[PDB]
Write a protein that binds this DNA or RNA. Structure first.
Ligand SMILES: [Mg+2]
Ligand SMILES: [Mg+2]
Ligand SMILES: [Mg+2]
Ligand SMILES: [Mg+2]
Ligand SMILES: [Mg+2]
Ligand SMILES: [Mg+2]
Ligand SMILES: [Mg+2]
Ligand SMILES: [Mg+2]
Ligand SMILES: [Mg+2]
Ligand SMILES: [Mg+2]
Ligand SMILES: [Mg+2]
Ligand SMILES: [Mg+2]
Ligand SMILES: [Mg+2]
Ligand SMILES: [Mg+2]
Lengths: 109, 251, 138, 176, 199, 148, 190
RNA sequence: UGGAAUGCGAGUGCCUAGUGGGCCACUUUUGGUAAGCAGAACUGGCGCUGCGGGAUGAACCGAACGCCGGGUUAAGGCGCC
RNA sequence: CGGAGCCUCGGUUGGCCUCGGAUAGCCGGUCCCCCGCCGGGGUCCGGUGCGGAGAGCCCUUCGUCCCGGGAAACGGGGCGGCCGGAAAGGGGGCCGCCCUCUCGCCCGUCACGCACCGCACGUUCGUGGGGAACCUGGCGCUAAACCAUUCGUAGACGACC
């Protein structure tokens, strides 16, 4: 057993300087510091995973306090390896600076 | 526009805020800088303002109008019965300034000093230091004290004693003793602690701290005068008698 | 203090650029920043290259400044710079760098097992050498 | 004209439009250095108009084509005669460069004129470009490279991969 | 977990720019030896800069700010604060992810320190340019613990030297051990060389 | 937009930014293009430009509506009287500037082109200044590739 | 313009031994040793030959300011050679119109007392730099002799004395009193 | 052979509100030392108008607006904010 | 100091236990030579696009059974003592023990385990932080603060002595 996902950070939303598009999140992936290296991560699943007070059903398990918002990488952002991600719901601003799991599927290798 | 005629400002902004002292006993903000070549000695003392008189003496000031002549000089009498050393406190120099390192206390402490540790002596069971004192009386505890002294010799840079006053010899209503840290200047740190350790529970007369014709500094709290207006507090000019709404003001 | 000099015939390793990883020879110096280089035996056309993308090696071929590619190749083959290069630790470290990069998942597993066993053997011997050194101290 | 990218050398040939007075007007040729051929023709009409009673409306371009460097693998010294407008006058300069192509040397002239004199490309007229022998060069910056046994080190090599890694344990070494 | 940086030989503003972006992404950063930090330009023109800052004070009540911190650590801290949106909860959370120290107090004295080559003075300055030392500048604007910090930094270096000699000793044994057991580990040494781990 | 430029841009049918049209060149039209020089990038399209422009983004003006040319009958019913009955006849009339260029070209709705992918240089100055306005000759084709 | 190379060489006398620790120059001679650190200059120092030693200074790719530092290093190194072989001897004369300037040497020539300078009651006490010895001149009246191996220490020592005896609030073109550096020689003439 | 190009459906009639303080900019221009001053021509603006950029700003630069998704841009930018 | 659980709060999903520094120079061996309270300089020898490399190193987890080959035998696991650390102090190493194992590692042999029938929030740090309680054992503790009263070195009232 061991980790099966890459470590990312929720850097912020899509934006100009004074307008914010919350439907797109900018993700920073550990070890990906150029745009030509982001190609592996396009289309891969992304998960904002967190905990709440109330229990919720777990697929393949019993209810617990873990919750997840799923998404996926949609395209690269910039020159230094940032990617754009989209989630089933806009990410909460409290998630900025926190871990975003990037899964190794859908596999293309 | 510019003020018509120049005049210096009233009062010093260097003594601000003109508030009530948080302490009743004068605090030594700076002790004399330590010179490891002098013998171990104390640098401060506690006394009580008794009152003022005047004396007669013959001045010796060549080139003066009062050379070989008698003058009347006012003097202050400060009653300074011997203090009792009750503890040692060590300090370590850190990049954030001095930090208290280790405090040791003598085995015995008089009730005058213990009164300092209480807000209501009447209602208290006088339990202060009743468990600390047992450390000097057993072999295990004694072996820890000398380890504390050895630690203070390794690391501390400043040594101070904890001396208190003897209020049972003064004529004052107060029986609670005034307890202050006095810095031990002089030789090496080890010599400071040897000197201090021999003097736990001992008395120190003022004559062992000061000498005749010595220039000293007196630190204390001034006489309180309560709520005062600007005329008295800051010595501003009184406004003319015709002023409406008061003249003991700043216009 | 300086041991490697930009001069006619100096062989320079190309660290980045379209010709990264190749050896070229300084044929001529254009200005402070650029040189005319040639790679007749290393698949580089004669061209200008900045000194920024160059790392001087310890080989210095002997041909006249701005001699044509025929004589640069001739000097390259006589000095056997290709085989001499591969014998240097510098070349070997490059080879090790690429061997590790291409390691497969199975290769990484086998290295972990070999490394696991090799490190245990060394540690046990070091323990014994430390204990032996202790007895001399006593 | 913007001196964008590396300039190319164009051979532009033009003439006045034939008329009953002169059915075969004389042909004129210019050396033009420009980013593209569209700019090259534009500058031609700007220059001939300053020398002849001609302009795009009363003339035509007969041939526009790039002149290729003839010895792109040989180092040469280029003398350049140019005139330019400063903030407070016009001046004639002679300048020298070392390069493999004549259009590369002319590009260096535009960057250099911009660096040392804050002269925008629209205020520079390259009058003449010649290849000059080492013995005829005048500028000591160019002549110091006329040494058959030239050698020199590369002192204080600055780390240019300053963000790969962005954080490291060892400090960089500048001596090689 | 924690990114520990060594401030010696780093230029003040380039270190702050990188550090500020790091704590805004949620990483903890410790910068030690802030007195070892550098600023480009001669010392004098950098002293005049802080004296110009020192003159900024609320004319009607200086106690209400600006607060002119004199420690090289706090000077650096305020410089990182100037590159953060510190008047919002997000910026203040980041600002709490940064610790700044003069000297190297425990536990960082016995941990490895990383550097930032994009802020190193040897990289970013021309060697002929003048520069200032944050510690000297701080000492000459009211900092009081320059002499003590140097005293304690010399004790640390003496202990670190003994630690280094112990590590060199344990490395000389390591090389000898590899010769003694060369026969037994030769097979495993071939796997590593085959894949680039050992050259 | 100044009144004289506003009228000329309306006659070219370029009433919107990044709209496109073919304009057959002659003294009358070349001098109209000079009035609108700051507001247009123009030049000479090659055969490939005429193909792609009319296939991807070609719409006919049929009963004053904008109808995609998805079927050949759309062309034939309107321009058949000029013997233009297929997209190839329409591309040949435009590309070679035939006898009925006017009719076949007015038939085409102004091309709605997208923002240039990869950017511009400087829309506010001429092409020969390093900008975008004016006549760039055959270089229009590079622009057409990035906007079609 | 950057110049490809600019260099100068220094000849080392046989009785002087020069060693380099990077850019630190150590010159050892009959009269002692002088160490100077040139780490504030980006040059290249080289010792050439074995029988007739030489010191070379190189500056690759130097602009006008950096080229000016090449000879400065050579001149300093030559002075160090001069110091450790012949030494430096500055002489000073004391000038006065009315009030004699009395000089007393204390502490084995490391302290100078100056009295009655323009009749002032104030006593001036000038401390010589380490490695510099002051002495009254037995050969001439109203003269001092400063000797040492470092030219800058000796010449700085003399500047201290010369500026100690400065006239104030007078016309210094008329009131010329003072001690001045009158000669710059060597301890051992050779 | 509806006799230049290009574009576009036109003509016509009743009734009619508000307005009738303007102000700004490129260029031209009068008075004035000049003015964020007074007074004109041309066009375009603000007024009536948001939006991206010029930190901030009636008028500058880009661009004009139904409620959205994706893409791409302009003018401007890309150490950190 | 030595059991089950119940709330609530979140994030995280291996570790690096350290020379000092130079940058027109560095790093490691070498004590044969010279100094010092085992350390410094010299010599000599190696490395230097740093490989005694953070472009790195260490650990690596499917488990168990049977029997072999390498590796260990100076070994793995487990209660008592002494150095040692102060800038914001060490659940490191060492010595005893009565115990406790021949398994931990590598290459093989031999089978087995819910093989839950393609699918998410899996996998740690985690006896995590804070809060109530419930037990269940041992050794220990039996205070002060404020009000009220008094004082007048204080005082608008509070506060203060
Ligand atoms: Mg979890
Ligand atoms: Mg005044
Ligand atoms: Mg009245
Ligand atoms: Mg202060
Ligand atoms: Mg794009
Ligand atoms: Mg405009
Ligand atoms: Mg006078
Ligand atoms: Mg006006
Ligand atoms: Mg209105
Ligand atoms: Mg309108
Ligand atoms: Mg608008
Ligand atoms: Mg502005
Ligand atoms: Mg959009
Ligand atoms: Mg900005």
């Amino acid at each position: 057993s061991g980790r099966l996902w890459c470590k990312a950070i929720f850097a912020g939303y899509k934006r100009g300087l004074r307008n914010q598009r919350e439907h797109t999140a900018l993700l920073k992936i550990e070890g990906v510091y150029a745009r030509d290296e982001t190609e592996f991560y396009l289309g891969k699943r992304c998960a904002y995973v967190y905990k709440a007070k109330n229990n919720t059903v777990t697929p393949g398990g019993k209810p617990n306090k873990t919750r997840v918002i799923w998404g996926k990488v949609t395209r690269a952002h910039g020159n230094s390896g940032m990617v754009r991600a989209k989630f089933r719901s806009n990410l909460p601003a409290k998630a900025i600076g926190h871990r975003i799991r990037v899964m190794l599927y859908p596999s293309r290798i | 526009s510019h003020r018509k005629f120049s005049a210096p400002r009233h009062g010093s902004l260097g003594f601000l805020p003109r508030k009530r002292s948080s302490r009743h006993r004068g605090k030594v903000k700076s002790f004399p800088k330590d010179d490891p070549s002098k013998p171990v000695h104390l640098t401060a003392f506690l006394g009580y303002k008794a009152g003022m008189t005047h004396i007669v003496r013959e001045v010796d000031r060549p080139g003066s109008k009062v050379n070989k002549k008698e003058v009347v000089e006012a003097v202050t009498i400060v009653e300074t019965p011997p203090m009792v050393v009750v503890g040692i406190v060590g300090y370590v120099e850190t990049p954030r300034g001095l930090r208290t390192f280790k405090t040791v206390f003598a085995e015995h402490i008089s009730d005058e000093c213990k009164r300092r540790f209480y807000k209501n002596w009447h209602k208290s069971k006088k339990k202060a230091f009743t468990k600390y004192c047992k450390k000097w009386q057993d072999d295990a505890g004694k072996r820890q004290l000398d380890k504390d002294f050895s630690s203070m010799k390794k690391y501390c840079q400043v040594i101070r004693v904890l001396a208190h006053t003897q209020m049972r010899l003064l004529p004052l209503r107060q029986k609670k003793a005034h307890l202050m840290e006095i810095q031990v200047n002089g030789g090496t740190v080890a010599e400071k602690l040897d000197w201090a350790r021999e003097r736990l529970e001992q008395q120190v007369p003022v004559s062992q701290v000061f000498g005749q014709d010595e220039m000293i500094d007196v630190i204390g709290v001034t006489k309180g005068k309560g709520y005062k207006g600007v005329t008295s507090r800051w010595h501003t000019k009184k406004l003319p008698r015709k002023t409406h709404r008061g003249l003991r003001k700043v216009a | 203090v300086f041991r490697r000099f930009v001069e006619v015939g100096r062989v320079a390793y190309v660290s980045f650029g379209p010709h990264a990883g190749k050896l070229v020879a300084i044929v001529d110096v254009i200005d402070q920043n650029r040189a005319l280089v040639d790679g007749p035996c290393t698949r580089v056309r004669r061209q200008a290259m900045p000194f920024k993308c160059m790392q001087l090696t310890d080989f210095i071929l002997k041909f006249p400044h701005s001699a044509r590619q025929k004589y640069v190749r001739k000097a390259w083959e006589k000095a056997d710079i290709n085989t001499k290069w591969a014998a240097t630790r510098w070349a070997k470290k490059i080879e090790a760098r690429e061997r590790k990069a291409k390691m497969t998942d199975f290769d990484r597993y086998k290295v972990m097992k070999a490394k696991k066993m090799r490190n245990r053997i060394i540690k046990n011997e070091v323990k014994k050498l430390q204990r032996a050194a202790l007895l001399k101290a006593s | 004209m913007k001196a964008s990218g590396t300039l190319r050398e164009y051979k532009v040939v033009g003439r006045c439009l034939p008329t009953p007075k002169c059915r075969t007007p004389p042909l004129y040729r210019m050396r033009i250095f420009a980013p593209n051929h569209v700019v090259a023709k534009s500058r031609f009409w700007y220059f001939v108009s300053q020398l002849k009673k001609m302009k795009k409306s009363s003339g035509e371009i007969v041939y526009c084509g790039q002149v290729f460097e003839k010895s792109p693998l040989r180092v040469k010294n280029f003398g350049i005669w140019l005139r330019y407008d400063s903030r407070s006058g016009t001046h004639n300069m002679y300048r020298e460069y070392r390069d493999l192509t004549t259009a590369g040397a002319v590009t260096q002239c535009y960057r250099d004129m911009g660096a040392r004199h804050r002269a925008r490309a629209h205020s520079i007229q390259i009058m003449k470009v010649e290849e000059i022998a080492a013995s005829k060069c005048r500028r000591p910056a160019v002549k110091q490279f006329h040494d058959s046994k030239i050698k020199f080190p590369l002192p204080h090599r600055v780390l240019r991969r300053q963000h790969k890694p962005r954080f490291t344990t060892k400090r960089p070494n500048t001596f090689f | 977990q924690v990114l520990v940086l060594d401030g010696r030989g780093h230029l003040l503003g380039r270190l702050a720019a990188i550090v500020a972006k790091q704590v805004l992404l949620g990483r903890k950063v410790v910068v030690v030896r802030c007195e070892g930090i550098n600023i480009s330009g001669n010392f004098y023109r950098n002293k005049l800069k802080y004296l110009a800052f020192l003159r900024k004070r609320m004319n009607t009540n200086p106690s209400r700010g600006p607060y002119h911190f004199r420690a090289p650590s706090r000077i650096f801290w305020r410089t990182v604060r100037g590159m953060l949106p510190h008047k919002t909860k997000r910026g203040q959370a980041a600002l709490d992810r940064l610790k700044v120290f003069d000297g190297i107090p425990p536990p960082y004295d016995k941990k490895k320190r990383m550097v930032v080559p994009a802020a190193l003075k040897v990289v970013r300055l021309k060697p002929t340019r003048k520069f200032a030392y944050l510690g000297r500048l701080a000492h000459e604007v009211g900092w009081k613990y320059q002499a003590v910090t140097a005293t304690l930094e010399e004790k640390r270096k003496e202990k670190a030297k003994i630690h280094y000699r112990k590590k060199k000793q344990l490395m000389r044994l390591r090389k000898q051990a590899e010769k003694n057991v060369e026969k037994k580990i030769s097979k495993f040494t071939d796997v590593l060389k085959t894949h680039g781990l050992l050259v | 937009v100044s009144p004289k430029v506003r009228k000329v841009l309306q006659l070219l049918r370029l009433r919107q930014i990044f709209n496109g049209t073919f304009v057959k060149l002659n003294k009358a039209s070349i001098n109209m293009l000079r009035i609108v020089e700051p507001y247009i990038a123009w030049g000479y399209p090659n055969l490939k430009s005429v193909n792609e422009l009319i296939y991807k983004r070609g719409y006919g003006k049929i009963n004053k509506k904008r109808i995609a040319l998805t079927d050949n009958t759309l062309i034939a019913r309107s321009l058949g009287k000029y013997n233009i009955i297929c997209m190839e006849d329409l591309i040949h009339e435009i590309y070679t500037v035939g006898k009925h260029f006017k009719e076949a070209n007015n038939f085409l709705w102004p091309f709605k082109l997208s923002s240039p992918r990869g950017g511009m240089k400087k829309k506010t100055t001429h092409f020969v200044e390093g900008g975008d306005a004016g006549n760039r000759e055959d270089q229009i084709n590079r622009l057409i590739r990035r906007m079609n | 313009m950057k110049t490809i190379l600019s260099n100068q060489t220094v000849d080392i006398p046989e009785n002087v031994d020069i060693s380099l620790k990077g850019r630190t120059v150590i010159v050892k001679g009959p009269r002692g040793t002088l160490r100077r650190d040139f780490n504030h200059i980006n040059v290249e120092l080289s010792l050439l030959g074995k029988k007739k030693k030489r010191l070379r200074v190189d500056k690759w790719w130097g602009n006008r300011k950096e080229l000016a530092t090449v000879r400065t290093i050579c001149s300093h190194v030559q002075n160090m050679i001069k110091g450790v072989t012949l030494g430096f001897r500055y002489k000073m004369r004391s000038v006065y119109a009315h009030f004699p300037i009395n000089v007393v040497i204390q502490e084995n020539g490391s302290l100078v007392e100056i009295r009655n300078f323009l009749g002032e009651k104030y006593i001036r006490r000038v401390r010589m730099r380490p490695g510099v010895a002051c002495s009254v001149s037995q050969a001439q009246k109203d003269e001092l002799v400063l000797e040492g191996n470092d030219i800058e220490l000796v010449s700085n020592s003399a500047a201290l004395i010369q500026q100690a005896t400065t006239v104030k609030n007078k016309d210094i073109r008329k009131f010329l009193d003072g001690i001045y550096v009158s000669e710059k020689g060597t301890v051992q003439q050779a």
